[PDB]
Amino acid sequence: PSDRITWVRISSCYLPLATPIMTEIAILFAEIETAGGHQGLGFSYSKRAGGPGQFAHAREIAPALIGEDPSDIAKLWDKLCWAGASAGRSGLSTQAIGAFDVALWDLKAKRAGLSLAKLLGSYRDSVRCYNTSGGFLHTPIDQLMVNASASIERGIGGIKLKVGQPDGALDIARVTAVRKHLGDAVPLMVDANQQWDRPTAQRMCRIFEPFNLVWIEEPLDAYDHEGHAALALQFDTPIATGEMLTSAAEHGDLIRHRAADYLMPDAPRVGGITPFLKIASLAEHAGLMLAPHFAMELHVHLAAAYPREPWVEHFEWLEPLFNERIEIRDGRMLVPTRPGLGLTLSGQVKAWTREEAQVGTRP
Amino acid sequence: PSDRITWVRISSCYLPLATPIMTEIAILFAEIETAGGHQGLGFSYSKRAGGPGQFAHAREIAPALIGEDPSDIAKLWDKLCWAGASAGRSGLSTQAIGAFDVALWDLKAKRAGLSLAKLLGSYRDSVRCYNTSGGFLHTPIDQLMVNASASIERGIGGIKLKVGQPDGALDIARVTAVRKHLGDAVPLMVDANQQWDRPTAQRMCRIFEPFNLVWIEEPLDAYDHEGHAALALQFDTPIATGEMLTSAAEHGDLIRHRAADYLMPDAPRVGGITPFLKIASLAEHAGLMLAPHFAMELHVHLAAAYPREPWVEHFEWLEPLFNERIEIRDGRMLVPTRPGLGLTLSGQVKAWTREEAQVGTRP
Amino acid sequence: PSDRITWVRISSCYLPLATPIMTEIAILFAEIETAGGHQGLGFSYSKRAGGPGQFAHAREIAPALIGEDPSDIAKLWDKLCWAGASAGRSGLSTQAIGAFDVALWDLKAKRAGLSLAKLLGSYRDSVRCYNTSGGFLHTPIDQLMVNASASIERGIGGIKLKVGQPDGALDIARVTAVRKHLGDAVPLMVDANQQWDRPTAQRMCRIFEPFNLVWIEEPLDAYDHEGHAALALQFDTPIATGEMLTSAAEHGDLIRHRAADYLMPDAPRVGGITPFLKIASLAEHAGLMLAPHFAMELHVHLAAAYPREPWVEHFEWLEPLFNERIEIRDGRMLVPTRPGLGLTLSGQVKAWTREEAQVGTRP
Amino acid sequence: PSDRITWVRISSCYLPLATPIMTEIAILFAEIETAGGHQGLGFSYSKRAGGPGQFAHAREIAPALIGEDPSDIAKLWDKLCWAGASAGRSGLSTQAIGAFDVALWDLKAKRAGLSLAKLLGSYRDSVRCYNTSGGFLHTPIDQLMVNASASIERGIGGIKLKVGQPDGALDIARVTAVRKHLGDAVPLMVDANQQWDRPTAQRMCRIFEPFNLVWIEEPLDAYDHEGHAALALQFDTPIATGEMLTSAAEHGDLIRHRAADYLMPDAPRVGGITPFLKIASLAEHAGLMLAPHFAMELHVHLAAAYPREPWVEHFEWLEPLFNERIEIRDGRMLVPTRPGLGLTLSGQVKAWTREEAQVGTRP
Amino acid sequence: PSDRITWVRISSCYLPLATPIMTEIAILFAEIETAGGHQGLGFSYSKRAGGPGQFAHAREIAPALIGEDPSDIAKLWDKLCWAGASAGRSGLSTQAIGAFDVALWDLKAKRAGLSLAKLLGSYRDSVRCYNTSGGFLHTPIDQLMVNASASIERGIGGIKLKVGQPDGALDIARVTAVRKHLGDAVPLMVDANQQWDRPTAQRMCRIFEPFNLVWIEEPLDAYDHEGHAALALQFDTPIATGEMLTSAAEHGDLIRHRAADYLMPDAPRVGGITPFLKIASLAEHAGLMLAPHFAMELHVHLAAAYPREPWVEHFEWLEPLFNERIEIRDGRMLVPTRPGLGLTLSGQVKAWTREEAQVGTRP
Numbered sequence A, B, C, D, E: 001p002s003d004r005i006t007w008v009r010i011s012s013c014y015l016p017l018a019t020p021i022m023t024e025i026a027i028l029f030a031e032i033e034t035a036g037g038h039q040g041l042g043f044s045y046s047k048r049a050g051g052p053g054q055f056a057h058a059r060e061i062a063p064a065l066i067g068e069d070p071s072d073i074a075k076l077w078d079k080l081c082w083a084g085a086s087a088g089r090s091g092l093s094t095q096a097i098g099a100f101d102v103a104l105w106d107l108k109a110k111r112a113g114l115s116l117a118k119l120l121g122s123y124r125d126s127v128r129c130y131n132t133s134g135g136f137l138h139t140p141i142d143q144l145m146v147n148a149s150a151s152i153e154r155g156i157g158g159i160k161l162k163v164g165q166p167d168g169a170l171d172i173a174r175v176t177a178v179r180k181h182l183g184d185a186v187p188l189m190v191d192a193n194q195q196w197d198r199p200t201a202q203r204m205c206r207i208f209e210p211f212n213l214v215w216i217e218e219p220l221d222a223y224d225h226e227g228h229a230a231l232a233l234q235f236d237t238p239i240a241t242g243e244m245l246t247s248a249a250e251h252g253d254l255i256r257h258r259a260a261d262y263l264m265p266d267a268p269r270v271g272g273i274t275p276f277l278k279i280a281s282l283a284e285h286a287g288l289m290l291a292p293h294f295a296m297e298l299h300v301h302l303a304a305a306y307p308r309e310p311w312v313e314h315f316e317w318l319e320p321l322f323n324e325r326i327e328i329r330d331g332r333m334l335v336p337t338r339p340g341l342g343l344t345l346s347g348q349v350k351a352w353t354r355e356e357a358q359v360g361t362r363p
């Protein structure tokens, strides 16, 4: 083999959130080291229930990696999946596999002395970014307006507003208020978080049309593909969805329905970089736009490798976990130039680790 | 509410197999009790990796059941799924949910003093059954021949032979040998266990055509829907598949492709009775036949409720876990008449339990 | 068996209407009792011609229920259908079967000490409701306006206005008048009762778009599925139809055409709860909304069991037939908590019964 | 940038064939070197007219590579294509681009100290191989028989026989003769080289069915997708095609028609490794088998990276151009383990070079 | 044969542009003469990279024309294509073939003493024309406004404006300015040159709707057929595309998608008149409009032969190459009446020729 895995360590780290949304996020870290002295770091996560399950499964299948050639990433993804075949090809088991998968990609990239973006091959050195500016449905427009202004001032390229509350007139007012404040030149998008039924989504999308939003995210249930397809066919405003999906197959179904103008795959959630690339390949062929969701630390690299100009969300919740940081400038997020994912665990991770296990002999 | 859940207990029981094939099966038991004194028992399982993950997730979401009306089964399935939304609608998380789901159905049936089959409404009091007679690819033909003949004399209604070895001539020989021994009056089916590629499956199905087998099971990868549909369109022999799928959505895709003459949903594997019923409704409408896989203790009830004559496999591995037994006669297994699933945990379960947890106050 | 039917009584009851619409409605009541002392009550109906036919058929097939296990509801639906096979799977014969079907469901629910909603499993304890406030095309807007206001005051959650008269400008005026009176906050829907041809429906739907109605009901002939599908594709306003259909097959065709945003199945009209559930399963899978038509006494239970928020019409014409009543509060209809359908025949039913028959020996 | 391209050299080398079939093959070699001291070698080719055109275009666009980051392979493929946009996305211009593309991949692999197969990630360390044993339509049966048997004793895993001559009876005779000589255990395939019209292909495939050939290659015109799809739907024997196609788009069309059981993309012919990977992704998703055509020195690496067991032709014509060799044993060719493609130009290349050019300053 | 080719001369002529756009255009001229004394002139071209490749290939395959019957044009197109089969059916090789193809058509037309338009059969003696009036995105509206006015004054029938710059508000302003200047009676069209992504194209097309433009050209990537089809389905304004395509197959795909209201095939770019006619036949059958791109000297003849009123661009860049000129009158371009294409090489061609070759003996 090109090398061989000799040690693996998994940790279940509970990241406390500065502000309740959801008071914490369970992060599954996977560390892999080889006889050749190469090392990789990867992770998966669970918002709400899922952390314990991901860790337990990861611990059970980890031994299957020992002795294997780390360069055969897809092959190993398949081997770990087969090791837990009755668990399926999506959900907790493949998310656990994803932590290992990301680590192997990190390791291969470092082996070449290249950032993950350069190993895959990039199309740009910076990616369009946007943020919520710490805005929620319960955030007084006044505060959200001043926070969004600050974000723009520090380099954010767009603002995503939370909508989808029983009183639709409220959202329209809030959005109207933000648009008047920032100006027509600031890109604006909304996220309904699956709060609308088909009739309501139909009416709200109609109202938002004049706003020229970048996109309307998750207007319906994440699984209502025909519903999303119907909205995309009817309205000029792009429809964005997919962040809730957990496998290449689900994204394939969404794509088959032409249910999204902007596909929002979540690498950790779908099983890692390996399945994410298969999804990106399908989206590319279908001529769609890409807007990866969550984990910017990983997605900035994946987005950089997509043919068409993508959008990545500037999200700072995971920063305390790492020693590195992402920098933003003139509406764009810079793609890190360091080898691999360019991440190392902060000293704070230890204090937040509730479970851990390892197998093999460390080099 | 009709009632209120007050106590829940989950157990991870490792069933040792008298004959390695894999030397054990992880069973997740869920016990539910209410303020009204009602009780239910359900379970899910994992062959190979999966047991630890299912238990861990079940333990984390169990508290969400306390205080809820046990009669709103589908509603609670959704609540538990939402409680772990980032985990998706299939795989380990929904299988954990399935243990609770089965228990709720068991409890509702008992509440009406009806077997699960009668609660759902049955079409028959006994179901066609078949077995492998402890035969595997490595079992010497002559042994499998006397074993099969023995199963027939005990009342089994059919024999499923394992095939799919590199030397197709061998399988053809073994099947020919079995057919000549038992006679043309004994129903025969084969299981290739996803071992054939499209070209090989094409040639083997061609050869088996004259045999008039009941079905050819899993000739291709469980996810090659187009491949299976092509075989079903070409050959007279029914194609059976679906045992590997873990969600209603995956079965829906298989059904959309018309990839199976006999659909083989596995209740515990797809998330319980609730999603299984949705799958059965889709199969019924599509005019397909049903042959549920594994867990006869549960599937005999579900099969009894299907409009068209189904087939259920009679296999003994799980018996040690329960105090009750399935009866077979004249080629069919009798649908139990006791309330609910008609199962209670044996004293052996305790000794095989490696993990357990409970929440709430037992009535 | 779980039990066995020993007595059956059918009655043809003619319900006189307080105000001509249609001066009466023929109701077919079915009573079923078992050796175990269990009892069930169900019914079907005919607006205009149909009462005599339903009763005659019910009387002829009733004997087929004696001795049968009441828990095998679907099986018995099929047996009664086969008993009159040349009559088909829809229309008068299956509507007669439906009376028996509803009774069997009522009996099974009572057996478990659960309301019908809880036996099926509910998603809500109350359902959105609406009414016409005794409004017809010939009702002076002035009166309809004050009546609608009263309905809202007593808890009704929406108002359905009758439209579809030769003078379209009239309907627009009437609707404009009602909207201005009640305010934009009161949900409003219209019912054209199949009075428009494709061109007219096209023009009227266009005009109603700004109104933001909950739905436009039966704009075209109940059987013009392509016509309805075209309207739904073109307009934001939901299209509602299906109330005239009499079988799962017809609803399946409507669904295949994507001819309705809100499907309006009528349990009694399609053959009872058994076929209604098959229809609801198809609508659920297609991602549609549900708005059962007529018989709120039965549909409130069925609606409660649907995944997505349905709408049920508050209709008081059938009240004199029963001793129980439905209560409405804050725009919602409360789902009864009593066992089964929660209905018993009033003493007035006897005086209105024109035909009756029974078979078997009462327990 | 990760690095920077500083020098590029292109050579048009005419490979003389020891045996006319066409007496030579024009090979376009591309050498790329960077400021960081990294180097890559790639190539494209033309059988018959094409060599001069490929070189001329390569020379004209080569300057566009100077100063660029060699790691952004896909990006540069697009830049060179845009540099000659009026030339399209297929044919001579993209084949010229492919020589550079292969060199960039070779360079990236070497950068990581990995073979091309390991950089991409492999599923196997050896690939099934087959050869023609120097047999053509004019080769006397008995000679081809001893030649084939010889290839088998040296380790070849299969024999491809050339067919498609006006006298079909002859082919059938020759194939029958070969089959009887080698035995039923030696895999056999035939290549009709687009010689049959639909009617003839239909009859010949019918006759070959009993033979159980691995595949029937190019039975019809390379562009008759409907024709090929019809044959594949009708016959058990796999249909193989695609070797003549020159772009991802053409392969996509073939795949859309389901016109091939075995897709035969030719990396150099379609524009290099970059477009080849896109084609492989499409074939993988469609559930097809892979059998890359020509250039085993390159395809052995690409085939190793495909999920399902592929077939690669072992043919010796290009060996004189390189200092390295492919090893075969037990019916499979070993995937080279050296860095990158594992190829270096032999001293003979210089003598066969008719044209060459370079740009930039060599490090 | 009807005659036989005895001499062929190819020249690579670099046409310098009066103003940078692109400072020159490579033109490939092909001259063919027969034993019968007949002669033909044709050409192909490359904007940016492509000239050297086209010439090199043309030189290599030219010998294949000697001795052949010039009247069998399609047959010879196929023979030359086969002569370079590994080069494919599009791109540089077929463009080289196209130069010869045009010459053969010119020769056949002259043989009959008919213009090319009359040989094919025409529907009109003049064709609607339009121009850019030397306008580019960087041209100050003031100048573009006065230039467009002059064009109209000298007989041009329409104005095409360049759009597709980052600042969409700019294009709208420029177009608004031009429309106000020339008046609503002057046909206006825009060309976005593939500068918009789907979302942007969607928004810009919406804005342009009120303008009643003749068409919106290349709003998206030339290969995004689904994208173009979606725009055409949604908007009243015709979508025009196809100028970038290089083969009948690509145009066929575009047509299959109903991706264009106005198809813009480029004869030289797709391989000559032979493939252009196949494309025109497909467009005619699909009921589309035709707007050939570039080379008016050739397209005026081809456009004249199309059933529906086409549009041809008045483009003067190629004039210096020929001794003849096209005349425009009352918004239409007159179809030349001279034999064949009606073109002869100017004395300036010699000075601009960088490469040339000939084969055979001149008559």
Ligand SMILES: [Ca+2]
Pocket: A231, A232, A233, A234, A235, A236, A237, A238
């Ligand atoms: Ca859209």
Ligand SMILES: [Ca+2]
Pocket: B231, B232, B233, B234, B235, B236, B237, B238
């Ligand atoms: Ca079949």
Ligand SMILES: [Ca+2]
Pocket: C231, C232, C233, C234, C235, C236, C237, C238
């Ligand atoms: Ca609609």
Ligand SMILES: [Ca+2]
Pocket: D231, D232, D233, D234, D235, D236, D237, D238
């Ligand atoms: Ca086939």
Ligand SMILES: [Ca+2]
Pocket: E231, E232, E233, E234, E235, E236, E237, E238
């Ligand atoms: Ca249009």
